[PDB]
């Protein structure tokens, strides 16, 4: 060929062969991910080269963990990664719709049709589908019940049903706490701490904070009832001078004086803390907890323990904000002019030892604008799975709140959009109508696979559902327990409008760009 005469070690796939490559890879991905879709899907186990185990049903995780070296698979994995980074859910469905668009386009390109016409039909169908989506979207006041149904629709796909019923309340309560009226939800204000000791259904929402470390001085209390929290970012350990000072003495007595003096700088900050503590709690009734983003040497730990202060050091840069929003103080980088108004309050602070590590709970805050999800479970992979599930659920509830609209689920919107595309087809000029048909049969992959996963006949279920939607018009989807049509909005099966829109847009775009590929080429050597 052309490239192989100049770079002999070049790999090239031309026109039809290139199409053959790309579509084949897409269909391969679909075959892997088809089983991930829905609550009746199957969990895959993924073993790293080190031997670490992952139990997952998540499309993005599955992609990045499968062992694949294909360029089309790389493209589709990146599209799914963007879907996950922006919406948190929709990756499996993204891959499925991409694969099905490519397959339905191969249906007509094998018949000698040019991919350009299919892509024109794709663009027309995208427009009409986005219109029908905005029309059918359900604008709803996001109440705890609506958000609970949303989070259920996500967690029931990602985890077991009882654990999903737990994570639902956990996630919805978590978001409804860190949420400020008409102010985008900062999910950073939900810490996510995992503990590896108890059952997975013990995963809870602490209306406060859980630090993965505790006090390093033993004489420090392990439980504090009415606590003043001092969130600081001030070094309380020995800091050497920037200018390489060095000490010079002529006598052991002078050496002793210099040893006592070299710590005066940090002794002064410890003294400031101790004076604040004494001035704010003159008795032993209340407690005082210092949480430092920086270090605290053993001398400072002793000095603070002697006065009855619980000092934790080298906390996380995000815990500064989480503590100032949960407890309610001010985070400090200096103790120059500190006042009791710089302190937060916690109605309980205590310590929990788990094997070799320590955790510190800060609870009974007044109205914490930051909370934590304590992911308890008996196994590392259980914890990872629950983390992925709660990420999905948090993104789902956040998106349902941000986008006050919510879309019916169980493939209902896909069925209805397919019918609408099929009714719209004649209005398209030329043979791009065939691309529209392909788009419809691509949209129809969501209910089909759901049936495929619940153990039903794709064709029979899909005809039943489309018939029910044409006779009634009720947005209906798959009942995974009977295989019959069901009204998703009535049974509480909700999807995110943002997710469906992102699916349509990104899937159409990547499928168009793949269909217009006519040469794959590796010639960089």
């Amino acid at each position: 060929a052309a490239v192989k005469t100049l770079n002999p070690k070049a790999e090239v796939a031309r026109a039809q062969a290139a199409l053959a490559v790309n579509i084949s890879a897409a269909r391969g991905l679909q075959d892997v991910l088809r089983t991930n879709l829905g609550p009746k899907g199957t969990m895959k186990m993924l073993v790293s080269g080190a031997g670490d185990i992952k139990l997952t049903k998540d499309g993005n995780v599955l992609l990045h963990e499968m062992q694949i070296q294909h360029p089309t698979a790389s493209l589709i994995a990146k599209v799914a990664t963007a879907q996950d980074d922006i919406t948190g859910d929709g990756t499996t469905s993204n891959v499925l719709i991409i694969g099905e668009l490519l397959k339905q386009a191969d249906l007509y390109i094998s018949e000698g049709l040019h991919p350009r016409i299919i892509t024109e039909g794709f663009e027309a169908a995208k427009e009409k589908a986005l219109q029908f989506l905005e029309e059918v979207k359900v604008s709803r006041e996001m109440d705890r019940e609506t958000l609970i149904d949303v989070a259920r629709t996500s967690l029931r796909t990602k985890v077991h049903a009882e654990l999903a019923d737990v994570l639902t309340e956990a996630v919805v309560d978590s978001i409804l706490a860190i949420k400020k009226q008409d102010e985008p939800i900062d999910l950073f204000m939900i810490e996510i701490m995992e503990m590896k000791h108890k059952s997975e259904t013990d995963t809870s929402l602490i209306r406060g904070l859980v630090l993965d470390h505790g006090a390093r001085h033993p004489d420090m209390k392990k439980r504090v009832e009415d606590a003043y929290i001092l969130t600081c970012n001030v070094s309380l350990e020995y800091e050497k001078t920037e200018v390489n000072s060095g000490f010079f003495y002529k006598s052991a007595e002078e050496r002793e004086k210099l040893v006592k003096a070299e710590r005066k700088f940090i002794e002064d900050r410890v003294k400031k803390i101790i004076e604040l503590k004494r001035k704010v709690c003159g008795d032993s009734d209340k407690g005082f907890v210092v949480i430092n983003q920086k270090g605290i040497d053993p001398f400072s730990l002793d000095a603070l323990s002697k006065e009855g202060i619980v000092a934790l050091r080298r906390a996380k840069r995000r815990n500064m904000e989480r503590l100032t929003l949960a407890c309610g103080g001010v985070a400090l980088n200096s103790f120059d002019d500190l006042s009791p108004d710089c302190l937060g309050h916690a109605g309980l602070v205590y310590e929990y030892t788990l094997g070799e590590e320590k955790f510190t709970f800060i609870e009974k805050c007044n109205n914490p604008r930051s909370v934590t999800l304590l992911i308890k479970g008996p196994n590392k992979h259980t914890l990872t799975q629950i983390k992925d599930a709660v990420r999905d659920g948090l993104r789902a509830v956040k998106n349902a709140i941000d986008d006050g609209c919510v879309v019916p689920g169980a493939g209902a919107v896909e069925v209805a959009m397919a019918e609408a595309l099929i009714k719209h087809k004649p209005s398209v000029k030329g043979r791009a109508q065939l691309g529209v048909q392909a788009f419809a049969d691509a949209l129809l992959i969501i209910p089909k696979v759901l049936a495929q996963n619940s153990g039903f006949d794709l064709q029979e279920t899909l005809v039943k559902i489309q018939a029910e939607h044409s006779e009634s018009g009720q947005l209906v989807g798959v009942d995974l327990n009977t295989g019959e049509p069901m009204v998703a909005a009535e049974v509480g099966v909700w999807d995110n409008y943002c997710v469906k829109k992102q699916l349509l847009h990104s899937c159409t775009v990547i499928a168009t760009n793949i269909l217009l590929v006519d040469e794959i080429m590796r010639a960089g050597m």
């Binding site: 080269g49 080190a50 390093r216 983003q293 080298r314 906390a315 996380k316 995000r318």
Partner: protein, 317 residues
């Protein structure tokens, strides 16, 4: 890919994972065209190399260097490639926090990892367990490594490097003439199994130089004896030497003999010190960055944003 910047108290020796040689040896590495393709480099050419004795003195310099070892001698972008930097053994935590703040905040690197130069040297030799004797220009280090990680508790640090070595030879003053003594140090300086039979036809012993701490063989022996008694066999039998200092005299067998003497009469000690690829640390870094366990060890950008200097310090205080 993954950029593997090997500082190694040498030059930048930067490149990509998979390359058998670095592509960006900046310190001591066109014109008449149009543009700023020489002036921008002419600025760096006369800039002092920050790392001295295996420790970063001037950070602004180092940052400017890295920036010029990314945009000019690699013509790439760090915002999409993970970086593997290297640090000297027993490197202060503060330097780690500084370089991690530079990479994640300035260069906005998606993920990075800091590896010990001796561990990467051992990697380039193909092994994952053993005790590395790294003696360069300013420092001497014994790093016991088991399962591929430098045990942070048995790192014995003594100081008898090229400088300290050529010192006594100078004794036997002016820059040029002490560099004649150092030229002889650079050339053949065969290690003596026994100085008796070596001077007859004419570091191991502190008294020789004038120190009063320990020999390098004593150092290795005690670094092996501060580890697990089961891995003791592997430490004793996989001692890997590195450093141009230790290469110049080619010391293998004198060490081997006196280490055997110190050790029990059980473990057989074999020292592999013939490589001299002159890029061992770089190749070890490339191997690591090529592996998937490097993705496992990634300090990610999100991790950095969430933890700061704590993520750089890996908690466990």
């Amino acid at each position: 890919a993954a950029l593997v910047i090997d500082n190694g108290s040498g030059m930048c020796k930067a490149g990509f994972a998979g390359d058998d040689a670095p592509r960006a040896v900046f310190p001591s590495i066109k014109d008449s065209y149009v543009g700023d393709e020489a002036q921008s480099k002419r600025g760096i050419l006369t800039l002092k190399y920050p790392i001295e004795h295996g420790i970063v003195t001037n950070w602004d310099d180092m940052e400017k260097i890295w920036h010029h070892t990314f945009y000019n001698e690699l013509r790439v972008a760090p915002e999409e490639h993970p970086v593997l930097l290297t640090e000297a053994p027993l490197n202060p935590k503060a330097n780690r926090e500084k370089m991690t703040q530079i990479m994640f905040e300035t260069f906005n690197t998606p993920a990075m990892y800091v590896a010990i130069q001796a561990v990467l040297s051992l990697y380039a030799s193909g092994r994952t367990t053993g005790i590395v004797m790294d003696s360069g220009d300013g420092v001497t280090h014994t790093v016991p490594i088991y399962e591929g990680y430098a045990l942070p508790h048995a790192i014995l640090r003594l100081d008898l490097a090229g400088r300290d070595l050529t010192d006594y030879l100078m004794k036997i003053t002016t820059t040029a003439e002490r560099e004649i003594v150092r030229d002889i140090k650079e050339k053949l300086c065969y290690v003596a199994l026994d100085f008796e039979q070596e001077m007859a036809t004419a570091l191991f012993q502190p008294s020789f130089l004038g120190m009063e701490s320990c020999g390098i063989h004593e150092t290795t022996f005690n670094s092996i004896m501060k580890c697990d008694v089961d891995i003791r066999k592997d430490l004793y039998a996989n001692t890997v030497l590195s450093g141009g200092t230790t290469m110049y005299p080619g010391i293998a067998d004198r060490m081997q003999k006196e280490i055997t003497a110190l050790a029990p009469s059980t473990m057989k000690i074999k020292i592999i010190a013939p490589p001299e690829r002159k890029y061992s640390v770089w190749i070890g870094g490339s191997i690591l960055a090529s592996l998937s366990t490097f993705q496992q060890m990634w300090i990610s950008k999100q991790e950095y944003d969430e933890s700061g200097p704590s993520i750089v310090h890996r908690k466990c205080f």
